[PDB]
Nucleic acid binder design. Structure first.
Lengths: 212, 129, 259, 156, 225
RNA sequence: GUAAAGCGCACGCAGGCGGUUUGUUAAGUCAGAUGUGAAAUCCCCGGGCUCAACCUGGGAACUGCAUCUGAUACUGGCAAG
RNA sequence: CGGCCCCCUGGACGAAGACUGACGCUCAGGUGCGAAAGCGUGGGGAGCAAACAGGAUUAGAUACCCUGGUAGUCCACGCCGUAAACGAUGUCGACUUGGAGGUUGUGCCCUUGAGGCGUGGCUUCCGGAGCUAACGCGUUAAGUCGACCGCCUGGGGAGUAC
């Protein structure tokens, strides 16, 4: 009855009736324990819904705060470790291990859809190694793109891109004072090299003018 | 009459921590100075500053972490009424090592761990936690 | 920065304590409360009876400006002492203006001597006078058309007690309270006094230079005991009262109001 | 997952024009076998209802405790009103050496090894409160490091 | 967002007398002018801005805001502010345990709703006169008390308040439940229970209105976001 | 304070405690060493009675005392402020 | 400790300076002061009034009430050494948010007015943190500490017996 008297904050109910029914719930920090009340004495109330409309794998997740904690909670009941993000379509890239992926993924067409509506958007279950594999497939590319940005000599470019985080793709909007710590920074020229990258972006826009 | 300066120090500190006072001032003494230095080293306070020539004033700056005070507890152990002297083996452990015990030794005033490392005991001034 | 400190002293420089700087803009009217904001901590709960002029209807709408009075702060919530008292300072300035040219010229119409001296009224307020001043000579305005219009020519003022007597006719013609407390004494000199606080046994009308009167509860009316002074007269209003009794020793001048 | 122990139940009276109205107080405590602990003190005309209330209240107003593995992080004192309590961390295998209400709270807390004496009053309610106080104030090594601006190895 | 000059014009800088203050407000006080405390606007402004930002953030995640003022001078204004951003409010006396004892008050809400329905949607008239008068009176009572919070459903996710000392019951409830509190706190008030304090003149009407309007604007922004 | 428990109030010898700085001493204090602190008993690791109790080898301990050699932060003494 | 005066006399506080240079704090024994009643010797004796007497009341009334009334109360010099001698709170020192007063200094300020802004001493009430069994205490602590002393260890028997 706690939920009925506004004591168990229940937002969405991304569940698949007839199979698994995992749903997270929040609560005003006041020694309430939302999942606990939903479960009861040894799943007292949990058993009720279990054999309610039919044998369903109902699950409750202790909602933490915001959408970041909703991701992991949507991967339950399993073992999430990390996840990636983006803009409008962030696409929660589930990051778990093969051993724990067996239960995490559960069924190809079951936990991949039930946990997909959990956040309301969609999730992309991956592997710990997969993350790193794709992670590097990003460092080389702000570089892995035929270097169409600033450009000067290549021997200096290798030593600059060694220390350079996230290549130079639009990196002028970041801290323009930590590359001056690099061994070799006289007059504002590297602060100018980044400007060249900005000009390269304008050049890319000029290439768009060449194509539009 | 004033009989124990160090203890007065400690009480002042305690009261400042209780009352959320930024800084606590009091007349200076060498032993007091050294104690303050030890505390700073042990990080219970931010900084101490003596000021004056004829009658210098020690001013400690108190430390507050997430609202509450840093010096959870601070007691004298030795006192004029009843002195306490400890041998290196017998030296104490405040809060099971999490706190410290200021101890005056032949080689100066130091925390109990430091004394143990040195290999010598002495007069136990105060426990801090 | 010191922006704010400079502003604080600026705003000190551009306000004063008494009701002097006409600053409070009337920002809400409802009957029976007017309210202003003169750059004070709170808004004043103004009566409507400080702000109706001489025939009983209101005169200032929203945005209008009159200063109020100060030097008393927060009885529990709020801010002021009323603005007509401010008008008293303007009346005092007009009366003082006489000194410059030795003649203050207004209208003054004095029908009858309350306490020996005809009562003279300037536009809204009516003040009480000593005997000689109503008439320059023994002319005696009782034979003049009732409430006649001449002027006021000052004969006598008490200079700490607001008793001012003025000469209506004859345009051609042109410690401290308690030692000599025998002026309003003899048996029955009536006075115009503002009441201050009604203590459920009293009213405490007291106007005449740092004295205290009590018209307590027995007279006040022509009913004795069921009266409850707050119902029957006012708060803060100038009334009919006279002495009836003086102690110069135990400083209890026991005025009356049934007269 | 939560475990719950009713420490005590006591009959209390209210005198009225007719006679004595009796009622029952239930002192319970609940915990998850980890840091988290909470006590509840319920009252009702009948016993089961009162204990139900005690459980409800305990389930709310829960409090966390920083446990080094099975025992405490350092000796700690805690008081409440009469019941003054000392409790001391102890080596694995020793078990909960504690008396009465205190014991109960320790068990639910998920401490397995303590040496613990209740000085002063042993009024279950007050003593359990005092226990809770001693457990709450107890801080951990990481916490003190943070407080003091140091690393854990510096503090040892 | 809200400038200092505007606040000065409103009369925020003014604060209670020097016998009625709270020493926990000593930081927030600047000086004492004519035996009246002055609030330090330099320290007030940034925190007010902060509070506004937090309120906006709350709105962005679809948070429920409750606007509390029962001073009966600024009851009208707080209701207006709540409506502008279609949020909820308590402009009349706060019922003791409105939030803590929600479940009971939820029935109260439901009864009020039912009565409203009867009044309006039924169009049934033909009721015994005295009984009809009684039902009307009940409706008025319940409208006064719970009009703003009737559509609220559950518990708010944040609590804006016009006076801390006056609404301390609501504040205490919010603390017990853990709801974030956004309080205007004059010198006499106690800000310990408050999470995002706001030093300003709770009493003066124009200042109250200004506070409300900025809060409403930032709520609307967060909703738009 | 009200549960037992502040002399009715003072002065004041003995006694207890004693602001701050420098120097010195080294009594207290601390460190190391030597001598002793009987054996048995207790405790640790072992051994022997079929096991155990019991017996038994070696250690540790006996928290102390005395001396010698250092340390000098604190307490004390002495000298100057 | 209370009408005025005078004579002799102790302390307290403030204002500035100047000096001494730790000379201090506490204190078992010891010494002194110590309400009222009480005692001794000598004075005094209006009023009041233990005791006492009578009149009432009452079942009784060795009381309460009434009418009287002696010790005493008053003075001098001795003794007594106790009281709910209470703040039922030992003394000395330091530190910790506030408000409203009272009293007594004192510095500045146009005292332009009984005022304005401070800064000291003593003092009444309320109240925060903290403390407390609670009541409450709360910068005059019953808070946070130090120095020294005094005292307590179930109720009665008993602060009695020897």
């Amino acid at each position: 009855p706690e939920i009925g008297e506004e004591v168990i904050e229940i937002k969405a109910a991304a569940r698949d009736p007839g199979s698994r029914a995992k749903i997270a719930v929040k609560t005003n920090d006041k020694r309430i324990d939302p999942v606990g009340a939903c479960v009861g004495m040894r799943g007292a109330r949990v058993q009720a819904v279990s054999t309610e409309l039919g044998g369903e794998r109902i699950d409750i997740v202790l909602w933490d705060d915001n959408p970041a904690q909703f991701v992991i909670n949507a991967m339950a009941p399993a073992d999430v470790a990390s996840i990636v993000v983006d803009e409008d379509k962030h696409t929660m890239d589930i990051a778990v291990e093969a051993g724990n992926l067996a239960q995490a993924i559960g069924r190809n067409g079951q936990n991949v859809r039930l946990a997909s509506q959990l956040s309301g958007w969609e999730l992309n279950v991956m592997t710990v190694d997969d993350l790193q594999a794709k992670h590097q497939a990003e460092a080389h590319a702000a570089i892995d793109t035929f270097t169409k940005y600033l450009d000067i000599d290549e021997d200096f470019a290798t030593v600059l891109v060694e220390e350079g985080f996230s290549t130079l793709e639009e990196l002028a909007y970041v801290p323009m004072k930590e590359l001056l710590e690099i061994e070799g920074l006289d007059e504002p020229t590297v602060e100018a090299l980044r400007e060249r990258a900005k000009n390269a972006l304008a050049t890319i826009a000029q290439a768009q003018e060449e194509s539009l | 009459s004033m009989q124990d300066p160090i203890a007065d120090m400690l009480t002042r500190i305690r009261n400042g921590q209780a009352a959320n006072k930024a800084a606590v001032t009091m007349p200076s003494s060498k032993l007091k100075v050294a104690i303050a230095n030890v505390l700073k080293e042990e990080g219970f306070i931010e900084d101490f500053k003596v000021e004056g020539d004829t009658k210098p004033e020690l001013e400690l700056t108190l430390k507050y972490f997430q609202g509450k005070a840093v010096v959870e507890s601070i007691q004298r152990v030795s006192r004029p009424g009843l002195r306490i002297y400890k041998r290196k083996d017998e030296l104490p452990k405040v809060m099971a090592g999490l706190g410290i015990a200021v101890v005056s030794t032949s080689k100066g005033v130091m925390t109990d761990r430091a004394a143990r490392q040195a290999g010598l005991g002495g007069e136990i001034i105060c426990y801090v936690a | 920065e010191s922006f704010a400190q400079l502003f604080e002293e600026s705003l000190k420089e551009i306000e004063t304590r008494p009701g002097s700087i006409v600053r409070g803009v009337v920002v809400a009217i409802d009957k029976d409360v007017v309210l202003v904001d003169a750059g004070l901590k709170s808004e004043s709960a103004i009566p409507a009876e400080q702000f109706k002029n001489a025939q009983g209807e209101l005169e200032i709408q929203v945005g209008d400006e009159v200063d109020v009075a100060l030097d008393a702060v927060e009885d529990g919530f709020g801010e002021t002492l009323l603005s007509r008292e401010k008008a008293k300072r303007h009346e005092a300035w007009i009366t003082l203006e006489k000194a410059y040219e030795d003649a203050e010229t207004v209208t003054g119409v004095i029908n009858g001597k309350v306490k020996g001296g005809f009562t003279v009224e300037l536009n809204g307020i009516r003040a009480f006078l000593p005997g000689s001043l109503v008439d320059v000579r023994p002319v005696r305005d009782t034979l003049h058309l009732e409430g006649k219009e001449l002027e006021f020519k000052v004969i006598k003022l008490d200079q700490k007690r607001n008793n001012v007597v003025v000469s209506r006719r004859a345009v051609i013609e042109s410690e401290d309270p308690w030692v000599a407390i025998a002026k309003r004494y003899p048996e029955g000199t009536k006075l115009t006094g503002r009441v201050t606080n009604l203590t459920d046994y009293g009213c405490f009308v007291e106007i005449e230079e740092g004295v205290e009167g009590l018209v307590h509860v027995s007279e006040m009316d022509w009913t004795n005991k069921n009266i409850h002074p707050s119902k029957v007269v006012n708060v803060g209003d100038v009334v009919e009262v006279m002495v009836l009794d003086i102690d110069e020793e135990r400083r209890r001048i026991s005025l009356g109001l049934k007269q | 997952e939560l475990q719950e122990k009713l420490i005590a139940v006591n009959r209390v009276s209210k005198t009225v024009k007719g006679g004595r109205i009796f009622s029952f107080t239930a002192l319970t405590v609940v915990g998850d076998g980890n840091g988290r602990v909470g006590f509840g003190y319920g009252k009702a005309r009948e016993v089961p209802a009162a204990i139900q209330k005690a459980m409800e209240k305990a389930r709310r107003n829960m409090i966390n405790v920083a446990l080094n593995n099975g025992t405490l992080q350092h000796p700690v004192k805690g008081v409440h009103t009469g019941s003054r309590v000392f409790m001391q961390p102890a080596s694995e295998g020793t078990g909960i050496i504690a008396g009465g209400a205190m014991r109960a709270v320790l068990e639910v807390a998920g401490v397995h090894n303590v040496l613990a004496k209740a000085y002063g009053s042993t009024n279950p309610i007050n003593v359990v409160r005092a226990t809770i106080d001693g457990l709450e104030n107890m801080n951990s090594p990481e916490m003190v490091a943070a407080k003091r601006g140091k690393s854990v190895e510096e503090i040892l | 967002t809200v400038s200092m000059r505007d606040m000065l014009k409103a009369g925020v800088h003014f604060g209670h007398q020097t016998r009625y203050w709270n020493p926990k407000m000593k930081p927030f006080i600047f000086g004492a002018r004519n035996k009246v405390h002055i609030i330090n606007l330099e320290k007030t402004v940034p925190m007010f801005n902060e509070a506004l930002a937090e309120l906006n953030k709350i709105a962005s995640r679809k948070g429920k805001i409750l606007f509390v003022g029962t001073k009966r001078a600024a009851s009208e204004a707080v209701k207006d502010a709540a409506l502008s951003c279609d949020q909820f409010f308590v402009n009349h006396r706060w019922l003791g345990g409105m939030l803590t004892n929600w479940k009971t008050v939820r029935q109260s809400i439901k009864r009020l709703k039912d009565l409203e329905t009867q009044s309006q949607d039924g169009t049934f008239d033909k009721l015994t006169k005295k009984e009809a008068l009684m039902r009307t009176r009940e409706l008025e009572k319940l409208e006064n008390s719970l009009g703003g919070i009737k559509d609220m459903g559950g518990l708010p996710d944040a609590l804006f308040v016009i006076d801390a000392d006056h609404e301390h019951i609501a504040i205490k409830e919010a603390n017990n439940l853990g709801i974030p509190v956004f309080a205007i706190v004059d010198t006499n008030s106690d800000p310990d229970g408050v999470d995002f304090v706001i030093p300003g003149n709770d009493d003066a009407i124009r200042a109250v209105t200004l506070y409300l309007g900025a809060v409403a604007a930032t709520v609307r922004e967060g909703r738009s976001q």
